[PDB]
Point group: D2
Chain length 422, copies 4
């Protein structure tokens, strides 16, 4: 009658690291934090980490923000503020400030947790689950908690093989036959390859399980360390590995997926192309990421919208759709929409051709537009007859064009070109 | 009198009569009350009266149910239970029992209010707004409250000209130069015409404003009256008219509409054909009912659904859509959808042709189906290759077929034909 | 396998039988169902079964209602309507119009669509804390088709319960419903092994069992009288000792469970919360009880008409109360209770909105909703006078309602 | 006709809930002033927000001019029940404290200017500017009517204050039409009111603006090299010079039960004033009526056990005189007089508490005596400690005001060697 599998999440608290400032998504995060980035027609990226907590039995969450992110706070307020504190459940907004240890010496990810240590101790959790709020994945944290307790570990790090050519952006580790971490290097310019596979490196997913009291001591010591950068990957994980108290958790043990024969899904959405790719996956016939799984639902802000409306064009002609998502509030006049994802309240006027495009909420596409392989940002007013995705040189002049050929259009770019955004 | 326009809704309580069976809707109301009938891809009919209350400043509502309406109670529970009683706001579920006065003498709508009189008196309301919960319309009751007080009336009846050929279903009235009601007949077989116009009759909309303490007295007397059918239209309104204390409120004074040049919108959704018509109106290019007006929004249960998904069919071909509404959770594989309204989580498989059809939530349409001029009820599993709307006699044998040719399909009908549900 | 303890509640649905009339509660249930009976200064009885479900991981609940259900439905609407169905959680209001099993059978179409693997049947008119997830594990490990939670009870009151006999494997061997001559437990004649009205069912097995019962013209359609004996004869029923799953702070204490059948038991259970060390711990954050969080002003104590202070001894005073001096002893005051000057209130339960006039003395009594006690009235000191004006139980507990006071000529407006 | 009801619907309220300060001493070391506990169960910002709701203004922007953890959490818990589709919300609008010089602070108007993009999209016709750190009841809809009837571009709520305290306020002079003729912000020598030298006509920091006019004014002010970007110091005098500013006497819209009483308004600037305003609610006849159902104050509805009174260790009863005891409290015997105990306050045996304000989660040890003091959140008072009886000893251990009111925090106790966990 052992109940440990059910008791561990109740004794745990999840801490979601929700963003230090960055700019790898370019203008896409100019006016919004990365965890607040739109995804899947109706979600924001942070919804996945939070929904993973709820579905894993962890109903106490702390979302740590490193600056005043308006749209992230509003999203938490409107879609993640339904809890009753008397039932041992909450979503706390924990403000961190970016602190410097020197003129150009930044304090790290661990410092954001250290600043809020007084509030976190009062949670009286036995286990602390540290999460990155800017990744898209489904994982059962209760299974990782079970693995963490079974191994007698003080710190357990979720791990996953990644292509070695992209491993320099990750913490890379080496483990023994017991999944105990033997070596750990943070963002190596020369990433060690996995034994028996030089094409891959064993990478850290930024997902940790901690003994609570051990984490408090470690942060107290780290805060007083004059040599530390106060970063989980750069400072804390190597130190725990050296003490022999750190273990690895292979992601397939806890990744939640409908098709058991498939590869484990995990997207860090680092580049504009990866973001564009991850959204369009949901529009394909067989998406890699299953969002119709009632057994692991993703919670978000339930926006009240009119049903998607399709009307004849100015010539009275019908519209055509091929492998596309049309969110609520959209109004499409004829046109051709193919391999695309349209967020809420998107207006597509007559005689349009939209192919492999991601249109964020409130986008207004004027008459006779052709958009290909692009991302149209919030509330853009595309002027009539505009063509995007057909002339590489012209696209790069007007907007942002990635090396792979993916175009990003914002209100500021269009206004710069003389197209009114009212 | 400075702040009266704002104070009146705060001193008012709305009673929504939601016991309607709507038998003329046939199997559509076999397992649900008429106020719980689906509409507009994402609403139920009762949402309009309740949203009208909220937008009018009347945040205290009593929904009277004349039996055990499970799905009506659940809808109120899901989408209309967000109120905080300490802020002088609530939506109360007030159960009434259907009572008989004789062998086949049914007590009326007023009896349902009388049964709950103890609870209603405790509201301490100064004005009571009586509403029908089975109609679709937008109205600002605060304008009617101002009109009611300025006229010094004890009872104010919202009225609107209707075609005389349909006026026998309504209470018909005649008014003087001051909007005071002079004559009133309830559901006349030969409806009196308006003096200005023999093509129209001045009809009652079943929407009343009452002086609260006057309403209580009237119901107490009516409960003891051995000659009364205990009905608002058949009994109470004629009595108030005879006393000279009843006044009329022209609907255009308070009807909310985007286009001021248009005709006032009001649908009683009495027949299957009218219900089918009112739904498809929203799919047209310029709908008569504007559901995109942010200035008078309609509140409902905000169901969490995946975005509407369109995928290629088995042959890898695209889909076509013409003047149609596709709600969230739907997944459409190719096919042709024209002049149709699809509610939530409707599944349309490959090679389908759907024309002038209303598909209620969770309908599963199999491969190679053709549906025309029909209403498909909740959770129907249409078997592969089924054709509807092309053979009039065949449709009438399998399902219900309206006089004008509109077909209604339910789970029970398909189960009788041997199609597993 | 290793995740079974967590996955069983997610595959379960709880059905709360909340049509209870509570005949032995007299006027206390004249205008309200027994699950809607006030308790603990701020709760309704049904809150415990529902809170037990939430704390057990069972977030899908069906509340079956029937008699005098207005105040019960409103309570569910106010305090138990915060769920988001997309996260596989709800509290359904299932109206029933023949015994307890018939109410479940009537709603069988809706319940099947829950697609539950296990069904937990609960009585919504009892006060207790239980972890149903532990009972679910025991149900699966025993391979049972039906598991019945059991507890030893004094044999002199065992005729009100279903009594059972079990073997060495907790398999139910004999079962009799409400026996006039209750069999005693082996090795203890002072006690009988009683059923708590709490069952765990294999879902598909329960549906079949209800289908057969509906077609049985000889059945009374009752869980205890009809279904449990049938399962016992087939050898498919098992017993679950309540201490396995009973939730309690003090591990040395006796398992807490109250059916509050009589006015005296209801009065007793309320005053227990006012004692120094209550048997029922309502300060345990590890098993909290959810209810309607009513917005109330903080309890206000003011000087009496003579400018004197007030005295309190082992009492609970809910929000919105305003007490003018007076003496309140061993009492429980619900929300918005007004106690005027020069009053003496001892061993009394005052339900919400009670107005106590000046110079009143109330002892060993329960005053019902919104009663307006006139000035100088004395209750609990003259037995015969109490019995003439109000209801007086055999043990001497007095029940006062607004209707009784109105009959005596005391205005209730 | 319907103007009285339409004006709040066309308005948006901006609550200024930021601005660092230290007039409350350690009381605001770890919380913003709008987040300061009050009345046993409220935070100060609840009044402005409740005034908006009760005035018909359901769209609110709370500007937080820095990172106030406990203020955001309170909004998240008690003011996040809105449905945006029904034209209602409480927005958290982040402002940062901006400098114009080495010690030249940009003012309250700058915080509104920073969020001008978000505010314009509200598409409001009128903007109501509110201070989120004051305690008062006011019907903003009455002030909106007065603003429109006077044809004003800006209307300033005003009231007479004692001239010896008027230097902390904006002081104004008005003509016979309540038009503002002279305005000076925080004068060292405040002008007296005509016909009463004991009083000055003061600004309450409550403004009604024509929305587009305010946006123009803020655009110009953001580009003004001479402006401190403050409503009182910069904007109001500028509008006054143009002759477009009007005054609104507070009694026109102040909400109060007793019509014969003086208008209630507290800025709670000092520890003594804060202590005073709390204890007023514990008196026999409080100046501020918190039992008025017609103007309820909304807050975080925290789930708490009923206030529990138990015998002390010697089995003796407890005594209470003119006190408020919030939910979750557990008092063991003891004597509680003229005090206000917030939620979850634990008072052990043999205690004497007089004229004291005990904030949430305070644990008072055995045999303690507290007088004329405010004990902050979660203080663990050690056994036998005495406060409020020795002025010199009190000033050494804690903070002691001029008037003799003592403030105790967890840090002060831990500094004295008394464990706080
Ligand atoms: N309809 C809109 N028009 C212009 N700006 C907007 C609109 N909606 C949001 N924004 C702003 O654009 C940025 C992106 O916000 P969001 O899409 O909510 O993450 C934020 O600064 C928003 O305030
Ligand atoms: N998916 C479904 N399958 C079968 N019956 C259903 C389904 N959804 C609802 N019902 C039943 O249909 C009746 C009315 O449904 P509705 O008003 O659409 O909720 C009720 O008896 C429901 O229990
Ligand atoms: N203040 C009140 N005055 C009179 N009757 C009431 C009051 N509050 C509730 N009731 C009624 O008393 C009965 C039982 O109330 P309750 O305590 O809510 O279960 C129901 O019929 C209620 O409608
Ligand atoms: N129980 C507690 N013990 C210690 N500090 C607390 C406690 N509750 C809140 N605080 C802190 O006290 C400060 C102000 O609290 P409050 O404004 O009451 O939420 C914040 O820094 C809180 O984190
Ligand atoms: O995950 C968010 C963010 O954290 C950083 C460090 O700032 O990297 C962390 O997470 C990585 C996986 O996402 C780990 O591999 C790494 O060890 C850890 O420091 C950023 O690189 C990343 O975007």
């Amino acid at each position: 009658h052992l109940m440990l599998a059910r008791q561990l999440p109740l004794k745990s608290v999840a801490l979601i690291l929700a963003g230090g400032r960055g700019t790898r998504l370019k203008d896409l995060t100019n006016k919004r934090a990365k965890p607040a980035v739109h995804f899947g027609g109706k979600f924001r990226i942070i919804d996945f980490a939070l929904s993973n907590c709820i579905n894993s039995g962890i109903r106490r969450m702390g979302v740590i923000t490193q600056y005043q992110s308006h749209t992230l706070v509003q999203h938490i307020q409107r879609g993640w503020s339904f809890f009753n504190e008397e039932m041992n459940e909450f979503v706390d907004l924990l403000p961190a400030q970016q602190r410097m240890k020197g003129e150009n010496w930044y304090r790290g990810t661990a410092d954001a947790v250290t600043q809020n240590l007084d509030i976190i101790r009062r949670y009286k959790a036995e286990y602390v689950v540290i999460l990155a709020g800017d990744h898209i994945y489904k994982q059962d944290y209760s299974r990782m908690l079970i693995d963490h307790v079974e191994k007698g570990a003080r710190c357990t790090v979720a791990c996953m093989p990644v292509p070695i050519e992209e491993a320099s952006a990750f913490g890379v580790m080496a483990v023994d036959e017991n999944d105990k971490i033997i070596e750990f290097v943070e963002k190596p310019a020369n990433p060690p390859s996995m034994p028996n596979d030089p094409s891959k490196s064993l990478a850290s997913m930024g997902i940790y399980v901690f003994d609570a009291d051990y984490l408090y001591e470690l942060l107290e010591e780290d805060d007083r360390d004059e040599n530390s950068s106060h970063d989980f990957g750069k400072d804390l994980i190597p130190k725990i590995t050296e003490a022999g108290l750190a273990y690895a958790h292979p992601f397939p043990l806890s990744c939640v997926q409908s098709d058991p024969d498939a590869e484990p899904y995990w997207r860090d959405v680092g580049t504009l192309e990866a973001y564009w790719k991850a959204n369009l996956d949901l529009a394909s016939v067989v998406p890699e990421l299953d969002m119709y799984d009632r057994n692991w639902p993703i919670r978000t802000y339930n926006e009240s919208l009119p049903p998607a409306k399709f009307v004849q064009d100015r010539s009275g002609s019908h519209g055509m759709t091929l492998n596309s998502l049309v969110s609520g509030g959209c109004v499409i006049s004829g046109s051709v929409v193919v391999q695309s994802v349209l967020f809420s309240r998107v207006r597509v006027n007559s005689f349009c051709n939209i192919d492999s495009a991601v249109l964020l909420p409130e986008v207004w596409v004027g008459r006779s537009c052709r958009l290909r392989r692009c991302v149209i940002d919030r509330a853009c007013v595309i002027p009539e007859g505009m063509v995007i995705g057909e002339n590489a040189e012209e696209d790069a002049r007007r907007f942002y064009r990635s090396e792979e050929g993916i175009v990003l259009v914002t209100r500021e770019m269009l206004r710069k070109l003389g197209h009114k955004q009212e």
